[PDB]
């Protein structure tokens, strides 16, 4: 089974590393400098955007050394100290990036389902969350700080910057740290991001559906008022208009001015209905037609922002899953190969061939991520 696998697959690897380096580096420079221009006086999402683009900026800043690493075919020539600092720094920027993306999914979830959270105490909370995110990321990168070292490989005739696990239990430590990367670097962020997407999709879609429901009941009840001259009919139709106007009030962005004005006019028209004046209430219903027909413009604003926000959440989820999925799949079944489950030689060879491309796929997530979040 054991043969020398095709090693001519890593010829274009440093070229891709440099392409991702220049593209993602320039993009993150544009975003970070834009935050250095507009600043954003005491905001929540802008801070997370800035720190995220900073983590990605440091990651792509460390990309060129690994491009040189793949250029010399796994030969590290910079020393053990640089292997420690730049390896653990790369992992640190990765974990900080993913954790910041998850935290942004949480902040958007709270900002959508609970529009109550609109205080300036939230930035002061971020003044503790950001150091907490960096703290959890460092404590997550400690295994990449204690084992990442330079070791000599004689069969390859190459000094490689590897994870120097104890050779007695090397496979167990490898599969264990790999499982730590799978759970801490994808599973939990996929649970949080996924549940956030299901929440925003549920609340958003049901919200818009209820909005159309109420609106159509409004037009139906007004058309009923216009062609019905009875005692206990205009009152009930006005009651339906008030109830459906109160249930459709829940539309937080102007809007509250229109909905509240409508509720007030329906209320006064109901006051005229409770006295017996029907004609004046019908003229007031014509004025209601003037208000609602003069206020359909923003009703489309709600729909447009519905579509845009939906495509934004779906774009974030699909981006994260598509990008960081193959790396953690190959890391998972690779960890299965470490513990003896997968002993097929050519399969493990395929793993070792496809892992670097997946690493560049996660780095591609760090590249396009500011393009998706900032723009």
């Amino acid at each position, epitope marked *: 089974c054991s043969q020398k696998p095709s090693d001519k697959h890593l010829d274009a690897i440093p070229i891709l590393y440099y392409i991702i380096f220049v593209i993602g580096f320039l993009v993150n420079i544009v975003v970070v400098t834009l935050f250095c221009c507009q600043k954003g006086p005491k905001k929540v999402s802008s801070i997370y955007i800035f720190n995220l683009a900073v983590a990605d900026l440091l990651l792509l800043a460390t990309l060129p050394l690994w491009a040189t690493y793949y250029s010399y075919r796994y030969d590290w020539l910079f020393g053990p100290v640089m292997c420690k600092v730049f390896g653990s720094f790369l992992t640190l920027n990765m974990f900080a990036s993913i954790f910041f993306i998850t935290c942004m999914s949480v902040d958007r979830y709270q900002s959508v389902i609970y529009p109550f959270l609109s205080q300036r105490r939230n930035p002061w909370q971020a003044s503790y969350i950001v150091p907490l995110v960096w703290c959890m990321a460092c404590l997550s990168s400690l295994p990449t700080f204690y084992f990442r070292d330079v070791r000599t490989i004689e*069969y390859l005739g190459v000094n490689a910057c590897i994870m120097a696990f104890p050779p007695e239990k090397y496979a167990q430590w490898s599969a264990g740290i790999a499982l730590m990367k799978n759970i801490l670097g994808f599973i939990i962020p996929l649970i949080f991001i996924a549940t956030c997407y299901f929440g925003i999709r549920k609340h958003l879609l049901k919200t818009n559906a209820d909005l159309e429901d109420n609106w159509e009941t409004l037009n139906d009840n007004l058309k009923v008022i216009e062609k019905a001259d009875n005692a206990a009919q205009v009152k009930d139709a006005l009651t339906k208009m008030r109830a459906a106007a109160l249930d459709a009030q829940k539309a937080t962005p102007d809007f509250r001015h229109g909905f509240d004005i409508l509720v007030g006019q329906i209320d006064d028209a109901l006051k005229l209905a409770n006295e017996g004046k029907v004609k004046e209430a019908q003229a007031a219903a014509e004025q209601l037609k003037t208000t609602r027909n003069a206020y359909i413009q923003k009703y489309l604003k709600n729909r447009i922002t519905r579509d845009q926000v939906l495509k934004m959440a779906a774009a974030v989820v699909l981006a994260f899953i598509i990008c960081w999925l193959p790396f953690h799949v190959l890391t998972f079944l690779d960890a299965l190969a470490w513990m003896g489950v997968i002993n097929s030689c050519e399969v493990i060879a395929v793993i070792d061939l496809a892992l670097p491309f997946a690493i560049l796929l996660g780095f591609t997530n760090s590249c396009v991520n500011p393009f998706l979040y900032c723009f």
Partner: antibody, heavy 120, light 107 residues
Framework: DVQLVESGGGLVQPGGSRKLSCAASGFTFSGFGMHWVRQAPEKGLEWVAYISSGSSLIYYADTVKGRFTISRDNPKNTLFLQMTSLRSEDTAMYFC?????????????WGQGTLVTVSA | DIVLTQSPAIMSASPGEKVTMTCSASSSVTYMYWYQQKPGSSPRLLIYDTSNLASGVPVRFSGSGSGTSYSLTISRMEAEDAATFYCQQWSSYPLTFGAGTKLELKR
């Protein structure tokens, strides 16, 4: 088509020095380790030295260790072997050979070889 | 530092015969390699990693062995095979060759 061309051989008086060159063409030179392997007249092969692709790992044979110095020039795709304190036992045909595979310790591509005769 | 001893040193073979040469090591060896060299030319790689055939080498050539005993075998002797064969071990640097085995064509 891999081409390795040695140069710099000749007649050297004992105690002198020499500089053997190995021009490489047909592949990416800055990726694979290189070996120096000599062969004495009417005798067999003898591994001399090995250098990595980034010059981070160097191995010398006990016979030439402390005297020979293997160096590398990736921007010019050239291998170098500086032979100091030459002796009659160093008279041989010097080849530069690699494996075209990370730097493994086998020789799948040999050069033409250059003759070094050490005598007064 | 591992000493390699090839036997026999000089052997002959007619076309259409099985040829086998041994390479014994002092210490244990991880991987064994086999090279062919004709007079007036450079060596070429026959066997890498003890028992793997190199590219362009006929299927007649096969390598075997483990521990401190290895061997090269030409299943069917050809007139183009008559040359000198070396074994080179790797278990830890430095690298060492054998003295060689001169395979002449029986006549």
């Amino acid at each position: 088509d891999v081409q390795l061309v040695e140069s710099g051989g000749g007649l050297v008086q004992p105690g002198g020095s020499r500089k053997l060159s190995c021009a490489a063409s047909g592949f990416t030179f800055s990726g694979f380790g290189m070996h120096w392997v000599r062969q004495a007249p009417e005798k067999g092969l003898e591994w001399v030295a090995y250098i990595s692709s980034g010059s981070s790992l160097i191995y010398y044979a006990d016979t030439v260790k402390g005297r020979f110095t293997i160096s590398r020039d990736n921007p010019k795709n050239t291998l170098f072997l500086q032979m100091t304190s030459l002796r009659s036992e160093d008279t041989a045909m010097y080849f530069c050979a690699t494996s075209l595979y990370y730097g493994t310790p086998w020789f799948a591509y040999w050069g033409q070889g250059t003759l070094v005769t050490v005598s007064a | 530092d591992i000493v390699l001893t090839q036997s026999p040193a000089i052997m002959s073979a007619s076309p259409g015969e099985k040829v086998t040469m041994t390479c014994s090591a002092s210490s244990s060896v991880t991987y064994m390699y086999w090279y062919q060299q004709k007079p007036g030319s450079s060596p070429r790689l026959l066997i890498y990693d003890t028992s793997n055939l190199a590219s362009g080498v006929p299927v007649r050539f096969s390598g075997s062995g483990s521990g401190t005993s290895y061997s090269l075998t030409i299943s069917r002797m050809e007139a183009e095979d008559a040359a000198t064969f070396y074994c080179q071990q790797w278990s830890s640097y430095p690298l060492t060759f054998g003295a060689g085995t001169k395979l002449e064509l029986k006549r």
